[PDB]
Enzyme design. Structure first.
Site, PDB file in Angstrom:
ATOM      1  CE  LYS A 134     -36.866  -8.649  17.184  1.00  0.00           C
ATOM      2  NZ  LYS A 134     -37.292  -9.742  18.104  1.00  0.00           N
ATOM      3  CD  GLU A 182     -27.586 -12.300  21.274  1.00  0.00           C
ATOM      4  OE1 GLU A 182     -26.775 -11.847  22.108  1.00  0.00           O
ATOM      5  OE2 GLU A 182     -27.690 -11.852  20.113  1.00  0.00           O
ATOM      6  NE  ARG A 183     -32.855 -18.310  18.213  1.00  0.00           N
ATOM      7  CZ  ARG A 183     -33.410 -17.224  17.700  1.00  0.00           C
ATOM      8  NH1 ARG A 183     -32.677 -16.219  17.249  1.00  0.00           N
ATOM      9  NH2 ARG A 183     -34.730 -17.186  17.539  1.00  0.00           N
TER      10      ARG A 183
HETATM   11  N1  LIG Z   1     -31.364  -8.710   4.756  1.00  0.00           N
HETATM   12  C1  LIG Z   1     -31.439 -10.062   4.687  1.00  0.00           C
HETATM   13  N2  LIG Z   1     -30.855 -10.743   3.677  1.00  0.00           N
HETATM   14  C2  LIG Z   1     -30.917 -12.086   3.595  1.00  0.00           C
HETATM   15  N3  LIG Z   1     -31.559 -12.857   4.491  1.00  0.00           N
HETATM   16  C3  LIG Z   1     -32.189 -12.305   5.556  1.00  0.00           C
HETATM   17  C4  LIG Z   1     -32.165 -10.843   5.715  1.00  0.00           C
HETATM   18  N4  LIG Z   1     -32.858 -10.567   6.835  1.00  0.00           N
HETATM   19  C5  LIG Z   1     -33.290 -11.747   7.348  1.00  0.00           C
HETATM   20  N5  LIG Z   1     -32.892 -12.782   6.584  1.00  0.00           N
HETATM   21  C6  LIG Z   1     -33.184 -14.215   6.841  1.00  0.00           C
HETATM   22  O1  LIG Z   1     -34.183 -14.374   7.859  1.00  0.00           O
HETATM   23  C7  LIG Z   1     -33.575 -14.977   9.015  1.00  0.00           C
HETATM   24  C8  LIG Z   1     -34.291 -14.561  10.301  1.00  0.00           C
HETATM   25  O2  LIG Z   1     -33.938 -13.246  10.733  1.00  0.00           O
HETATM   26  P1  LIG Z   1     -32.906 -13.002  11.949  1.00  0.00           P
HETATM   27  O3  LIG Z   1     -32.617 -11.523  12.031  1.00  0.00           O
HETATM   28  O4  LIG Z   1     -31.765 -13.987  11.853  1.00  0.00           O
HETATM   29  O5  LIG Z   1     -33.801 -13.414  13.222  1.00  0.00           O
HETATM   30  P2  LIG Z   1     -34.913 -12.411  13.814  1.00  0.00           P
HETATM   31  O6  LIG Z   1     -35.439 -11.681  12.602  1.00  0.00           O
HETATM   32  O7  LIG Z   1     -35.918 -13.327  14.470  1.00  0.00           O
HETATM   33  O8  LIG Z   1     -34.137 -11.540  14.773  1.00  0.00           O
HETATM   34  C9  LIG Z   1     -32.107 -14.649   8.861  1.00  0.00           C
HETATM   35  O9  LIG Z   1     -31.308 -15.549   9.631  1.00  0.00           O
HETATM   36  C10 LIG Z   1     -31.965 -14.936   7.385  1.00  0.00           C
HETATM   37  O10 LIG Z   1     -32.061 -16.340   7.134  1.00  0.00           O
HETATM   38 MG   LIG Z   2     -33.454 -12.083  16.921  1.00  0.00          MG
END
Ligand SMILES: Nc1ncnc2c1ncn2[C@@H]1O[C@H](COP(=O)(O)OP(=O)(O)O)[C@@H](O)[C@H]1O
Ligand SMILES: [Mg+2]
Lengths: 173, 84, 460, 113
Positions: free
Chosen positions: C156, C182-183
């Site tokens: 997300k 948020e964090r």
């Molecule tokens: N497009 C992407 N490319 C590489 N890694 C990804 C991608 N999307 C998510 N990730 C991995 O998954 C983690 C979790 O998603 P993130 O967006 O940070 O938290 P959330 O999805 O809970 O909002 C990311 O920090 C990263 O480690």
């Molecule tokens: Mg998030």
């Protein structure tokens, strides 16, 4: 707020007052007990965790001018269940009950200026005829009315103030 | 007789020598399963440490009207009512 | 002068007693000195004789029964205008960036009604983004709502950072970021990223983080909406990013029971639907101005059946559904092409070609899912040759949905790619028509346009 | 000194004077008809009332029965005496042999090492 708690004890008290022909005395005794309820240091004692009987005796001790049937027993019965704060409510309940039995209505009126006795007498008779009770008008002279009068008979009210008609026409517009 | 009767109540209560709890003091009124209820203690903050008899201390977590709910930090089987 | 006294402090909920005349009304603000700290309370219920039950906009610790309370006769009011641009603020509109006073010209109350039905404005002005699957399966228009659904760790935040980069920079109008729950680290990282990129001068930031008491997390979203609506009423086109609607609802849930309410189906408050609706119907594009909003939606236990994601599905133009299954398999972004859709995906609104391409992709992937267990248990060679052709094309298509992002460059060690919509349509049309049947599966994986696919195929 | 005020299944409410309330795990003894029953304190309620658990059958208990407050917890024999015998929760002998000749009795509510 504990109106519903007051209704049982108030009904017991009123039903007992007509069995002993002392409604007029019972009303002022209930006022006496309410004034005891209002005291600051007594209120702290009531907030304490005393046992009901000793608390009731501490309460009785400041109210020696009460009858055996009325004070010493009703106070203790209420203390057994901790409903002493309902005494203020019981008083108002008791008054309303009396007004019901005696076929009386404490009709209240408000006016922009003081009424003449003939006007007030006509209003009294007219409400005795609108209702089926001996009315007891009480008036207050408030300029917010602007003119005309208010008539309140408990829940029911009749509004003859010109401010009401003014804003009614404003809402028609 | 509003003023007269209120004065009468005041003089009998004073002659009875009953008195309010001092602020920052109270009495335990219930002990159960490591949780205690305290009467009085008006100047008590939430999260404050209240000193029990002995060196034991209690955390005041709940400030109800006419009651303070506190948690004992340690053994609680030694406490009872009437304790300041 | 002070007019009220505290009578109960249960957890985060405070009761205050006032004289029976001039009792504070609902959603008003109150003030009390928590020692040296000025503490604000918000009235939530008028109950009993002269008593109001309130929520603390701060830590409830240090409060005593009997403290004096002063009733401000207005709701929580926040600065609004250009002065909010480039500044971080809390729920009360107080600066938390240590740059000094906001310097506002006007202050607005955060509780206000939604636009009337005849104020609504219709729009079909499609936005273009660099992400393939989103533009293909769920294109969206300026002035609409977008929601990125997902479970824990499915992408997300990364997708929202990518969308900020792609949309906001081309956007010439002001933008608002509402960090609801948020964090702290990720808020600081966002602030520094915008400061480095020199786009902080057109963004207003409101942060209410995880550590703060429930009232702040409850009302920070309304603060953000108030700022966005000021910009909308000035006539400008606004971009509003909300980090989690979920924790708005959750901040409601924490305090609901303490307010005397009876619990609902899954332990939620009885007022979940109305609390969602009052907030989300304010985020609309009126005839004077337009707000375009992107929202991240948490999915508890990765289950879309939960009431919160279920109700927020019914509020959005375009819904990009991320799935933990596709994330675990390593396909990024983890968008589910079968679940993601948009109401702008009409042959009239988009090119007729675009509509047919999207429909065909969805049909093929739906046909693959039913064959998954068939092949898993009974074997690949049980298939007909037409079925095996379909399986090949399905796997190639499901690879071509992936993409490297500029903001997902730190995690993987590769450059970022931006694909135009025309190129996306052309590539998927070519794959479905079999013009690239002969290329291997990885020739489509993690590439840009289909020309880049054939270049990587040559390298392969 | 005290009196029973409530009997709810296995638990019994007992009232004591405001200045003579037993401790949290003290033991009480009541005469249920011609037989004696032991009650164990669990909670101190307000006004000198305490909740107790019945170490025996609760049937036949009228409210308004008087109780005796023992000034120690439940104590059981320990050691060489309790080594070839069957015993009850209160440390009484259950086999039809004679009394247990113990030199020492320990309270059953003790602290972990
Ligand atoms: N497009 C992407 N490319 C590489 N890694 C990804 C991608 N999307 C998510 N990730 C991995 O998954 C983690 C979790 O998603 P993130 O967006 O940070 O938290 P959330 O999805 O809970 O909002 C990311 O920090 C990263 O480690
Ligand atoms: Mg998030």
């Amino acid at each position: 707020e504990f109106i519903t708690v007051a209704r049982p004890y108030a009904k017991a008290a009123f039903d007992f007052a007509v069995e002993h022909q002392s409604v007029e005395r019972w009303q002022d005794m209930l006022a006496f007990a309410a004034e005891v309820t209002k005291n600051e240091q007594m209120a702290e004692l009531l907030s304490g965790a005393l046992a009901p009987e000793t608390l009731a005796e501490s309460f009785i001790a400041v109210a020696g001018e009460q009858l055996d049937e009325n004070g010493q027993n009703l106070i203790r019965v209420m203390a057994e269940n901790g409903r002493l704060n309902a005494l203020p409510d019981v008083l108002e309940q008791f008054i309303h009950l009396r007004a019901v039995s005696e076929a009386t209505a404490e009709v209240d009126v408000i006016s922009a200026a003081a009424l003449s006795e003939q006007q007030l007498a006509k209003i009294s008779a007219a409400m005795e005829k609108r209702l089926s009770r001996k009315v007891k008008l009480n008036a207050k002279i408030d300029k917010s009315v602007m003119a005309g009068v208010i008539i309140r008979a408990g829940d029911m009210v009749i509004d003859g103030s010109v401010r009401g008609r003014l804003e009614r026409l404003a809402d028609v517009l | 007789n509003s003023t007269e009767i209120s004065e009468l109540i005041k003089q009998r209560i004073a002659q009875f020598n009953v008195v309010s709890e001092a602020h920052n003091e109270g009495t335990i009124v219930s002990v159960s399963d490591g949780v205690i209820r305290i009467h009085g203690l008006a100047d008590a903050m939430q999260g404050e440490m209240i000193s029990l008899p002995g060196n034991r201390y209690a955390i005041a977590l709940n400030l109800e009207r006419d009651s303070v709910g506190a948690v004992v930090m340690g053994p609680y089987a030694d406490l009872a009512e009437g304790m300041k | 002068m002070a007019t009220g006294k505290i009578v109960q402090v249960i957890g985060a909920v405070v009761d205050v007693e006032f004289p029976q005349d001039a009792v504070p009304r609902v959603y008003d603000a109150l003030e009390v000195q928590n020692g040296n700290e000025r503490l604000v309370l918000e009235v939530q219920q008028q109950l009993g004789g002269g008593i109001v039950r309130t929520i603390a906009m701060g830590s409830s610790d240090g409060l005593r029964r009997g403290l004096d309370v002063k009733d401000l006769e207005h709701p929580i009011e926040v600065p609004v205008g250009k002065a909010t641009l480039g500044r971080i603020m809390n729920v009360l509109g107080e600066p938390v960036d240590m740059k000094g006073e906001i310097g506002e010209e006007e202050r607005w109350a955060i509780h206000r009604a939604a636009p009337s039905y005849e104020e609504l404005s219709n729009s079909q002005e499609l936005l273009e983004t660099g992400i393939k699957v989103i533009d293909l399966m769920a294109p969206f228009a300026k002035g609409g709502k977008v929601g990125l659904f997902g479970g824990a760790g499915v992408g997300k935040t990364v997708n929202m950072m990518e969308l900020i980069r792609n949309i906001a920079i081309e956007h010439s109008g002001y933008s608002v970021f509402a960090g609801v729950g948020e964090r702290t680290r990720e808020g600081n990282d966002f602030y520094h990223e915008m400061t480095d990129s020199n786009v902080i001068d057109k963004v207003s930031l409101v942060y209410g983080q995880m550590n703060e008491p429930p009232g702040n997390r409850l009302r920070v979203a309304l603060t953000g909406l108030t700022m966005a609506e000021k910009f909308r009423d000035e006539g400008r086109d606004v971009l509003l990013f909300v980090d989690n609607i979920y924790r708005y609802t959750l901040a409601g849930t924490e305090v609901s029971a303490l307010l005397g309410r009876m619990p609902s189906a899954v332990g939620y408050q009885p007022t979940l639907a109305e609390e969602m609706g009052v907030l989300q119907e304010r985020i609309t594009s009126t005839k004077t101005g337009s707000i375009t909003s992107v929202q991240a939606v948490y999915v508890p236990a990765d289950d879309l059946t939960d009431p919160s994601p279920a109700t927020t599905f019914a509020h959005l133009d375009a819904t990009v559904v991320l799935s933990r299954q596709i994330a675990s398999l390593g396909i990024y972004p983890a968008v589910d092409p079968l679940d993601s859709t948009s109401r702008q995906l009409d042959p009239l609104v988009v090119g007729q070609e675009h509509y047919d391409t999207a429909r065909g992709v969805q049909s093929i992937l739906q046909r693959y899912q039913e064959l998954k267990d068939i092949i898993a248990i009974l074997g690949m060679d049980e298939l007909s040759e037409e079925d095996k052709l379909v399986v090949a094309r399905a796997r190639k298509i499901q690879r071509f949905l992936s993409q490297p992002f500029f903001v997902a460059e730190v995690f993987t060690g590769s450059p970022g790619k931006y694909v135009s919509l025309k190129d996306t349509i052309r590539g998927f049309k070519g794959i479905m028509e079999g013009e690239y049947d002969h290329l291997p599966e990885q020739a489509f994986y993690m590439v840009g346009s289909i020309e880049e696919a054939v270049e990587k195929a040559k390298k392969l």
